[PDB]
Structure 1
């Protein structure tokens, strides 16, 4: 109960009823009290993490005489209408199943299986397990980044992708009302389970968490989002030790769902705060690295080949306006993706307000082959080409700030026209629209083809004396501006041929 080292069993419970729960930094339900210290040990107070009274349906998935290892799945429990809970042998336990519960209803303290280890010790297995939050749950192998976390947000999926098992940062307050991508990511990413550490601490970012989240829908199923979510609260009311520990608790819970074969998204909030008071400054930064090192897509423990994932999205909010010290410089050395939410884009109402010049993803090469093989062989070429055009536009805009626009040749005016179309018809996305709130991979590449083909044809036309003013008012342009609102991808695809012919009608009219 007490003991020396790093804590004496600072841990979490894992079994049916993690989903829909609201918790604190150390897994106590709807607001409890005070913990102290760390670096050595810690003290606690009363609350039961998972209900012992509630009865769960257990479907056995193994028989007497089955050999099992850590992570093997011995049964299933239908926990919400979205998520089947997978009952696994805890890590470090192996042997022969000598006893196993029949199908039926059971509380979580009941013994649903027994394992005889090779030395003969009999281990009793319940529907839940405990794990020290500060030790990475083990796995067979950490796979290299390969499969994108598909977000359905064009700028992210196309230009700044996150891999499943990857690490990403975004400017913080998740509760910030100036942006909604943080909410788009939670509901649309193709993770089955979300672990959310909303440490919104005061007023308008705290009671909006309670009794809206229960009404929030999971757009994929119609059912509520909380049926595939675990909330971890981090209020100003709470002790600084439980706040600190909350991310370790969240990522341990994420890892546990990963181990079942789920893709999970862990979203960690953060606030403009005074975190102050081992060779320090550098040490905390080294420990943060370790937290982010727990993200990954893995072959999980178990006898079946099984893959699961934890992807991390961390909020970042410096004390001041400037993104220099505390959290931001230290976070940006470890994360492979930064989505630079930009107050000046927001005021211009360019939405998602993601600065396409200051954001970055180091996963582009990691994920390209998944796109090429599954969606479009030209994904990476198109993406690179569109970015180069965005870079060119920005270089041109700088020059035109100095000398103005009147001296622009047709060619540069043309680059400006097409870059503007890319920004308006592709980067900008309407999270409030029934269609455009999510953009499937197949739609993203077709929209990109339409735009780049219009670019090719624009430059071909300039190259042949067609005035730009004639191209600017080509009727298909306005259809290109509305294609994000079209569900039918084949109708978007048809814009390619329509662009081609309209341009032919222009080559003709000029003898070009």
Structure 2
């Protein structure tokens, strides 16, 4: 009997005589397991690999799990149903402006950039020698307009073999794109969101997760990350977790502006879509397709952000087996996916660095986690931003719980902050975090015994922790200034707050009543500094704080 592990649509897991797992569209099957063409049930093998096309055409595109383009059908009750159609990944009709960057006689290796194509108004697409090709450029195209199938260069290998190069290349999605070296985490992916960059930093090339649960301001946070992180290119996977998602992706996504250029965000984005309507095999393949495309852009020397929010549609690619699916293996590959994240010295003759940072949504079963998509080789994820519904209901925005979130990149990125931005960055965050932890402990004790017997010193810690939460952790994504917080602004707002802490504890020491400090006028300016775009005006709050505390030391014995 045929196990019909999929409905006859767009891909299936084929298990052969002696070799397990391959895939097709019609009945002709591209294969991971090498095979000997013509097993049981009329199945004929092919060239080989499940692969993607990489060249001009990727940007602004929407694909399914195996890089076949759109085709949509109209309304319903979800109202936009989409499916992957057998057509070409990169348009064969369009003319691209090719600019040569190499010349006849140049020696080249894989990764070398031999030309450039302005693909969109945002991104210059770098044309690269495919991995494993090297030798002498014996022929190269003149500046001009060409379709993707046109040969733009010829390379003679050391054998004398002549290789024909196009503006695009193919790569098997299940094989990591090669590079020279994976560099240790070091440079932060700057999100411009205070709580993240300060307390739970992402490294360029790092791995982060958020809860996939709707609400808590997830789509706001995902939108903020996609548009503000200092990655040049975004690869987004999902689009199918709710009924209306595809609808919003077709109507609204072309409207979104890259705030850094004023141009459409789609002009540095590639979308991969996973839906209930699509074959279970394509959705399994989707993450590999996405990360291969991400790697391909890092190879050019770009920082890229691979963002996935498709847990339920991806996870429901769960399937029946009989024979042996695979116990200590179902999370071993998810590991190999996350393992493909990294900042690397890329292939090429020039020293060149690119990265893929991964931000993935994680949804166990519903609310509380157990074992589903949670805690196998968990330490594969180094950052967790714990979007928290309770915080959302208290209207604390970005609803990131600062007690259950973590980052293992704090020490990895501190040196970049110390030498480029502020020598005290790490000392200041640790100090602020200790205050938040103390506040939490105090709030729990108070819950029990009441707030009435609180000494001044503890009331002061509570006052300043509250200022940290309101003036620093809370950030307004909808505000034209506070939508992004530059690194220099982040450290300056922190110094203002921590200097206010220092002066508060000092004042209390010299017998200044806390009610006097709570009403210090500068406090309300500290409450609004996130809205101030001029960082020098924010810095001037340090002296203004100092001065006002002086007038307090005067109104008292000091």
Counterpart contact for 2:194–2:472, Cα < 8 Å: yes
Relative to structure 1, the CA distance from residue 175 to residue 68 in structure 2 (aligned partners, 3 Å threshold; closer, same or farther) is farther
Counterpart contact for 2:275–2:313, Cα < 8 Å: no
Whole-angstrom distance in 2 between the partners of 1:74 and 1:452: 52
Relative to structure 1, the CA distance from residue 178 to residue 364 in structure 2 (aligned partners, 3 Å threshold; closer, same or farther) is closer
Relative to structure 1, the CA distance from residue 414 to residue 2 in structure 2 (aligned partners, 3 Å threshold; closer, same or farther) is farther
Deviates more, 1:1-10 or 1:251-260: 1-10
Deviation at 1:321, TM superposition (A): 1.2
Scaled by the length of structure 1, the TM-score of the pair is: 0.95
Relative to structure 1, the CA distance from residue 76 to residue 506 in structure 2 (aligned partners, 3 Å threshold; closer, same or farther) is same
Relative to structure 1, the CA distance from residue 39 to residue 137 in structure 2 (aligned partners, 3 Å threshold; closer, same or farther) is farther
Deviation at 1:329, TM superposition (A): 2.3
Q: Give the structure 2 partner of residue 342 of structure 1.
A: 388
Whole-angstrom distance in 1 between the partners of 2:445 and 2:157: 74
Q: Give the structure 2 partner of residue 251 of structure 1.
A: 291
Deviation at 1:155, TM superposition (A): 0.1
Give me the CA root mean square deviation: 4.2
Relative to structure 1, the CA distance from residue 433 to residue 39 in structure 2 (aligned partners, 3 Å threshold; closer, same or farther) is closer
Q: 1:162 aligns with which of 192, 198, 202?
A: 202
Relative to structure 1, the CA distance from residue 141 to residue 39 in structure 2 (aligned partners, 3 Å threshold; closer, same or farther) is farther
Relative to structure 1, the CA distance from residue 35 to residue 50 in structure 2 (aligned partners, 3 Å threshold; closer, same or farther) is farther
Counterpart contact for 1:65–1:98, Cα < 8 Å: yes
Relative to structure 1, the CA distance from residue 115 to residue 41 in structure 2 (aligned partners, 3 Å threshold; closer, same or farther) is farther
Q: Give the structure 1 partner of residue 467 of structure 2.
A: 421
**Count of aligned pairs:** 512
Whole-angstrom distance in 2 between the partners of 1:42 and 1:78: 30
Relative to structure 1, the CA distance from residue 56 to residue 423 in structure 2 (aligned partners, 3 Å threshold; closer, same or farther) is same
Deviation at 1:449, TM superposition (A): 0.1
Whole-angstrom distance in 2 between the partners of 1:155 and 1:240: 37
Question: How far does the alpha carbon of each residue in 1:128-176 deviate from its partner, in whole angstroms, 9 at most, with x for none?
Answer: 0000000000000000000000000000000000000000000115798
Q: Give the structure 2 partner of residue 215 of structure 1.
A: 255
Give 3-state SS (helix, strand or coil) of 2:374's partner: helix
Counterpart contact for 1:20–1:230, Cα < 8 Å: yes
Deviation at 1:319, TM superposition (A): 1.9
Pair 1:451 & 2:491 matched: no
Deviation at 1:203, TM superposition (A): 2.0
Whole-angstrom distance in 2 between the partners of 1:286 and 1:51: 36
Relative to structure 1, the CA distance from residue 282 to residue 46 in structure 2 (aligned partners, 3 Å threshold; closer, same or farther) is same
Relative to structure 1, the CA distance from residue 100 to residue 485 in structure 2 (aligned partners, 3 Å threshold; closer, same or farther) is same
Whole-angstrom distance in 1 between the partners of 2:415 and 2:493: 20
Deviates more, 1:318-327 or 1:361-370: 318-327
Scaled by the length of structure 2, the TM-score of the pair is: 0.87
Counterpart contact for 2:204–2:343, Cα < 8 Å: yes
Relative to structure 1, the CA distance from residue 96 to residue 46 in structure 2 (aligned partners, 3 Å threshold; closer, same or farther) is same
Deviation at 1:93, TM superposition (A): 0.1
Deviation at 1:103, TM superposition (A): 0.4
Q: Give the structure 2 partner of residue 376 of structure 1.
A: 422
Whole-angstrom distance in 2 between the partners of 1:65 and 1:178: 53
Relative to structure 1, the CA distance from residue 173 to residue 267 in structure 2 (aligned partners, 3 Å threshold; closer, same or farther) is farther
Deviation at 1:31, TM superposition (A): 4.4
Deviation at 1:325, TM superposition (A): 1.9
